[PDB]
């Protein structure tokens, strides 16, 4: 099915997936100087204490760390949102150059890599339910630049070489997601859509401005990681970022001035 090749990627979701034209389709370059700072917004509320990390997979286009959300465990509240929200997984975007990576960008800047930390709406009882929903997700951005070490992302890599190959996974549990995230919330705001089929346009996307450093060493692991299923033929996972997508009728919020 789809992929980030030359004859799966991007350009061709729209003909299994014609949301990919949709009307709020992510992700988007955060222009920073036509983003309004809008001062109702409340701060982000990142409860992460009693995130109960399951297993790392490798599914075939990145790969992701599951949490258990039978339960309020690790969740989002506040900032644009109404509610509560469960995080469910984490998972990253990534290039095979440092230059690019990121899926949003920032007056059309770049970044190595991002993560995407995936939340759902508890009022709607389940993730698939969610997923229909305008309100149904939220989704925590994080990008990355090649610096100093991230010492919360270490033993992520550490384990990279388990699940080298599409349909690969292993236990990991016991993960602090709080080691991942910067210094400051600020954000920004916007509704979008899952950037991977189905596209669907159920996310409120929080980006914060802050990217966090990582070493080159430790995207080096990112990019040792294979698109492909063991026994089959090399291809290395790099660059399964989206573009940037149309804007079109929305308004992207800072939550700093
Ligand atoms: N790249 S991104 O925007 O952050 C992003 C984030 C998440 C996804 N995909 S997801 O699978 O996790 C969506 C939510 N999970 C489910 O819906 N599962 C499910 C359960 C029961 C059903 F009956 C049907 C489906 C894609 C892109
Ligand atoms: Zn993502």
């Not at 004859?7 to 061709?12: A, L, M, S, V």
């Not at 993560?115 to 993730?127: A, I, S």
């Not at 997700?137 to 090649?146: C, S």
Request: with cysteine; aromatic share 10%; proline share 7%.
């Amino acid at each position: 099915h789809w992929g980030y090749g030359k004859h799966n990627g991007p350009e061709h979701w729209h003909k299994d997936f014609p949301i990919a034209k949709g009307e709020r389709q992510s992700p988007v370059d955060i222009d920073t100087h036509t983003a309004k700072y809008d001062p109702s917004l409340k701060p982000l509320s990142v409860s992460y204490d009693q995130a109960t990390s399951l297993r790392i997979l490798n599914n075939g286009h990145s790969f992701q760390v599951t949490f258990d959300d039978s339960q309020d465990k690790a969740v989002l509240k506040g900032g644009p949102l109404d509610g509560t929200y469960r995080l469910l997984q984490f998972h990253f975007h990534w290039g095979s150059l440092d230059g690019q990576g990121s899926e949003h960008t920032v007056d059309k800047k770049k970044y190595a890599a991002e993560l995407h930390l995936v939340h759902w709406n508890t009022k709607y009882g389940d993730v698939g339910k969610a997923v229909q929903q305008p309100d149904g997700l939220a989704v925590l951005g994080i990008f990355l630049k090649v610096g100093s070490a991230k010492p919360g992302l270490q033993k992520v890599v550490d384990v990279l070489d388990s699940i080298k190959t599409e349909g690969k996974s292993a236990d990991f549990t016991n993960f602090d997601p709080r080691g991942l995230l910067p210094e400051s919330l600020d954000y920004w705001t916007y509704p979008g859509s899952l950037t991977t089929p189905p596209l669907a346009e159920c996310v409120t996307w929080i980006v914060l401005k802050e990217p966090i450093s990582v070493s080159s060493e430790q995207v080096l692991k990112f990019r040792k990681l294979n698109f492909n299923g063991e026994g089959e033929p090399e291809e290395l996972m790099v660059d399964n970022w989206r573009p940037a997508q149309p804007l079109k009728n929305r308004q992207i919020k800072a939550s700093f001035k």
